[PDB]
Amino acid sequence: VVGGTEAQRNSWPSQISLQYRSGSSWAHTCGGTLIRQNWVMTAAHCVDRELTFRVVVGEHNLNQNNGTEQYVGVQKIVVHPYWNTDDVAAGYDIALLRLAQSVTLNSYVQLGVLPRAGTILANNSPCYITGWGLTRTNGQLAQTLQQAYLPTVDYAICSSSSYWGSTVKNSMVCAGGDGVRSGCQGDSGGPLHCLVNGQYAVHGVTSFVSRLGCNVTRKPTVFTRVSAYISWINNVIASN
Ligand SMILES: [Ca+2]
Known part of the structure; x- marks a missing residue:
């Protein structure tokens, strides 16, 4: 920003961090919004590349432990049917990540x-x-x-x-x-x-x-x- x-x-509290595996490290690529305990809403161009993704909820400082984070893998990526990469001005830039496990909702993880x-x-x-x-x-x-x-x-x-x-x-x-x-x-x-x-x-x-x-x-x-x-x-x- x-x-x-x-x-x-x-x-x-619904803000999540979407990260991908780079070597044996993990790097921030995009945001998302938790909408179910097991579903995140994000942009489709975010999951264009064939990367291993993970979701962090209750995250605040990227490089320090906040003592509030929950890390969970992504088991299914569902992009809009009509999304086309060569045209972001076309729209349909939205995708749904179901999480490999449901996160625990508390004062830092909310929908x-x-x-x-x-x-x-x-x-x-x-x-x-x-x-x-x-x-x-x-x-x-x-x-x-x-x-x-x-x-x-x-x-x-x-x-x-x-x-x-x-x-x-x-x-x-x-x-x-x-x-x-x-x-x-x-x-x-x-x-x-x-x-x-x-x-x-x-x-x-x-x-x-x-x-x-x-x-x-x-x-x-x-x-x-x-x-x-x-x-x-x-x-x-x-x-x-
Ligand atoms: Ca942290």
């Missing part, structure tokens, strides 16, 4: 609340992005979890010519673009948490940023819109 601040350790189906936010709605991704465009990952206030840019303003044009679709939520704060690589797959009726709900799955950079005036972070996927999600969880 470019432009944020350290989250408190109990703040975002993400998803939006009702079809729910669109009013423009400039208060949302926070969270994650361990880059803190500078072309910089390096953060060790502690970062958060940043990112208000939505609605689909009309966002598909207009000064913002994202035709690159963005209505299956996606835009947030930010002040050119100071934003998501960045390592944040993908992670949550966009939007306050709605006194509760925070996970409305976005971080998907992408501009090739120019992460924080760029009028190039908000593009998230996959979760409220467009509730029925697909639920059809997958009730099978496996």
Whole structure:
């Protein structure tokens, strides 16, 4: 996250870290949101490569023990049917990881609340992005979890010519673009948490940023819109 601040350790409990095995070490690649004790929601481009993945919940500092972590392997990866790697502007950037074991829910491991189906936010709605991704465009990952206030840019303003044009679709939520704060690589797959009726709900799955950079005036972070996927999600969880 470019432009944020350290989250408190109990703040975002549904946030998970998605890591892959590199040699005999383990490295952070993406975020995710715990939605069942055995299912994580993440971006599809995160699990494109044929890597061994593991999920860390209740994680806060990547390099130190926090005394709150739970590590569990991924037994099945279910990507949207229509996802195409050569086109992230096409959408369907969402995937479901069933965990090899169920995690224990406590003050650090809680489930993400998803939006009702079809729910669109009013423009400039208060949302926070969270994650361990880059803190500078072309910089390096953060060790502690970062958060940043990112208000939505609605689909009309966002598909207009000064913002994202035709690159963005209505299956996606835009947030930010002040050119100071934003998501960045390592944040993908992670949550966009939007306050709605006194509760925070996970409305976005971080998907992408501009090739120019992460924080760029009028190039908000593009998230996959979760409220467009509730029925697909639920059809997958009730099978496996
Ligand atoms: Ca740790």
